[PDB]
Amino acid sequence: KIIINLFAPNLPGSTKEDDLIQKSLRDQLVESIRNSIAGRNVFFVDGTRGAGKTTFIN
Amino acid sequence: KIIINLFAPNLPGSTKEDDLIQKSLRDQLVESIRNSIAYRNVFFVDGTRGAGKTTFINSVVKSLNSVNIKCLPTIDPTKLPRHEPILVTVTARLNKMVSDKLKGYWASNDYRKQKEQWQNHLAQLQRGLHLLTDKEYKPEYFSDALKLDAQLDYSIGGQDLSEIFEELVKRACEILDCKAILITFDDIDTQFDAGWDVLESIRKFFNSRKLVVVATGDLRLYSQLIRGKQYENYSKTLLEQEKESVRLAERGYMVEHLEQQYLLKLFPVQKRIQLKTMLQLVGEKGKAGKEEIKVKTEPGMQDIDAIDVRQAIGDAVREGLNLREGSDADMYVNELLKQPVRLLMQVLQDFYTKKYHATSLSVPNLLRNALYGSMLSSIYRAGLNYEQHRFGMDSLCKDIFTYVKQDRDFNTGFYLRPQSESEALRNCSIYLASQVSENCQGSLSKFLQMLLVGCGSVSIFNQFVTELDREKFEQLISEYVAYMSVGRIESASHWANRCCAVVANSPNDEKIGVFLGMVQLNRKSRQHMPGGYKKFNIDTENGLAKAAMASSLSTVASNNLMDFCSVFNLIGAIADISACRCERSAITNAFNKVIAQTTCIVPPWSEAQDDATEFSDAITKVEQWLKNVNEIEIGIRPSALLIGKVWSRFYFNLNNVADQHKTRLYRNAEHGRMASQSNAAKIMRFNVLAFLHAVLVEESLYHSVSDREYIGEGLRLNPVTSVDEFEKKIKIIGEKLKADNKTWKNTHPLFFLLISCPILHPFIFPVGGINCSVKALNKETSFNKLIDEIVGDKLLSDEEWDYLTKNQQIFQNTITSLNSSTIVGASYDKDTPAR
RNA sequence: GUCCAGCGUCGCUGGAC
Ligand SMILES: Nc1ncnc2c1ncn2[C@@H]1O[C@H](COP(=O)(O)OP(=O)(O)OP(=O)(O)O)[C@@H](O)[C@H]1O
């Protein structure tokens, strides 16, 4: 279960800390990259809802 | 034997000898170059976009590497610098292997003589690059052209770069010790300027017998490129004046004449090779194809387990789209084969790779996700939805309507048949068939909802198509979507409420209350009614059946509130009750969710006991009906062809009743003894019977669980005036399922659940609408007794027959007030013809 | 043979005894 706190000790805006919920999706992408090396290799991340999505790459 | 791996990256570079799919055609060419020089000598492989040209060229070159000819490394004209001449590149490639064989010589004497001789030629050619890249002549080089040389004593004066390069190839053959050297060019399929320099160089320079050139591409680009270049020669000023039809067609032929002559002169006809597509390699299932290909669907899968590509795509199409094993599913796989081979695996590889990790199932969404990415560029051409997180149920209803509008066909469009002439519409047709089957996934009566909005919203618009001039098409097709509210809706009956105004905007030519699945019940007391007919009063309706009667009402505000009895409201309501079951509270809400509050306005395109528990007796039955609904309907697999076919039977069936009961409205029909008598409770009885009829024939024909149909081998007709057509289909179904020891709930699930619907029970047998029919009373008794087995309740109690078959009594599951109701325009001049 | 039923703009077709 993804335990999420709201009243953080520092109380950041929106309480976004790291791998908020995309953790399952990130692990799927990372594993594919590792398995890829073991010849095009370009992936893609589609623009969703107009989100900035720059925070995903970082 | 050509095995292929769907777990490898499938890149052109990694293609080995085992996985190569063009073994036969490559051999035909490998043993064709050698036979040429042994006794313009330019070859041309040809294939469509995404046919595997690059992975085929590399096979020929590799094979020739292992009487003797040396092959240069392949050149791709697109990746080269924009301003680098082709001749410069070839010389550098040739110099690499020439200046690598010299270091292989062992004799010191036979090193410096040839190397210096070769070195002179390069310096000789390096001074000739002035002519290739220049914009104007210069007299400073005139004296250089008029020069005598001791090298070969050039017969032709001047520079003449053609002859300078010619002897360079002759020298290179001596050093490399080979009869001829092949120059191989790659495709220009992404550019239209790399091709022109390739075409011009071949025409002028590569003419000697020591060179063989193997181009690559497709004639459509090359043909389009040359014709554009030929128009450039015409003087620009000439093309504004003299623009007459006779003059324009005169030069139009001449350019096309120079188009074919130049192209044929460059690439000879007797050397072009067309690369076979996926179809010719495999061939038809019954026909013979001169290859055999098997695929992989598992890592380390044994080659014996490998299966033919037809089954590798047939199983995906059959299971993914939920179609029967038949000709309908054969059209999809056949069309899907006639696609670029690049796209074929990316659909095929993606679908199976997800399936492996799915198990670690909703198979249609696996194909839906896989096919959406592949056929994504064709989607934009028809303007479909692009958001992935909004693959909603109602989103599809908008997509089908706009697709059939673009397809320019309303009679067949809802079938989603890939028969569109345009190739773009063929691609999106299969995708829509995947969307429809994905959303159902054994949907809890959403199929019933999706049947109405998905297909009914299309064919109802045919009414305006009949009598309807280009500006008006987008004028109506847009706001009709807005008024009827497809793509945005709250309930199925909400759509059916707006349908009544659409139906009643233009009536039948005889101005009668019968319409396409519509019956009008008068509310204003007409004066001096002949016979026993009375005004339709809302109160006399009995209990436990008023709720069914309550749903069948649809008031339309069109300058006069008129109630319309509609099967659409009946079937539209069934979506509401069967939506979700958590409590027995909203089950009774839908019975009056559309009454006393839902008002419908004229369409813009007009242009002209305590009684608080009487309902609860039926509620427990409807609650128990949802128990069977929420136990079997999960296990069904609705298709994308039933919805296109159930409506087609239903639409024609209703249209037959509309023009069959017009002139047959007359007195002495208040009891409905015999046929040829049209009462309101019988006209509505046909429409509800038509809905129960189209579902039976289509479910038996097309489904997933029903692998083989269960119906007689005879004519298929629709009951329009009688009931015998329906019962005989039940009879032939009866023994056939029992003969195979197959129950109705599993072999025919879609019909089973809706038959035992408490809403539709009190409309199958109207008390005065049922024909007495002493001859045909055998039919209805046999018609009803068969239903006593499909539904195990048998709630008839055998006493409610007597009142309705003998021509007071207490009725619960039968309406006893529609017979006396009247219909607008029902003149009563004539009476029953003698029989 | 007569009847029921069905499709077409009366003509045509289906079923039973
Ligand atoms: N023999 C083959 N076996 C497996 N896959 C193949 C084969 N030939 C072609 N393909 C598929 O075609 C894709 C593209 O191959 P290739 O680049 O040769 O085709 P093309 O698009 O017609 O060529 P080009 O790159 O010159 O435009 C490969 O990634 C692979 O999926």
Structural commentary:
It is classed as immune system. The entry lists the keywords Cryoelectron microscopy, adenosine triphosphatase, immune system. The entry is titled "Structure of tetradecameric RdrA ring in RNA-loading state". The structure is cut from a larger assembly and holds two copies of chain A. With 58 residues, chain A is mainly alpha-helical. Chain A contains two helices and no strands. The longest helix of chain A has 15 residues, at 23-37. The two termini of chain A are 25 Å apart. In chain A, 0% of the residues are buried. The interface between A and B is small, with 5 and 6 residues. Bound molecules: adenosine-5'-triphosphate. Chain B binds one RNA strand of 17 nucleotides through helix 30.
DSSP helix fraction of chain A: 25-40%
Which two protein chains have the largest interface (Cβ within 8 Å of the partner's Cβ), and how many residues from each? A-B, 5 and 6 residues
Structural class of chain A: mainly alpha
Question: Major sheet of chain A, described briefly?
Answer: none
Task: Assign an overall shape of chain A.
Answer: elongated
Total number of beta strands of chain A: 0
Q: Distance between termini of chain A?
A: 25 Å
Order of helices and strands of chain A: HH
Number of helices of chain A: 2
- Using only CA atoms, what is the Rg of chain A? 15 Å
Which cofactors or ions or other ligands sit in this model? adenosine-5'-triphosphate
**What oligomeric state do the depicted chains represent?**
part of a larger assembly
Strand content of chain A: under 5%
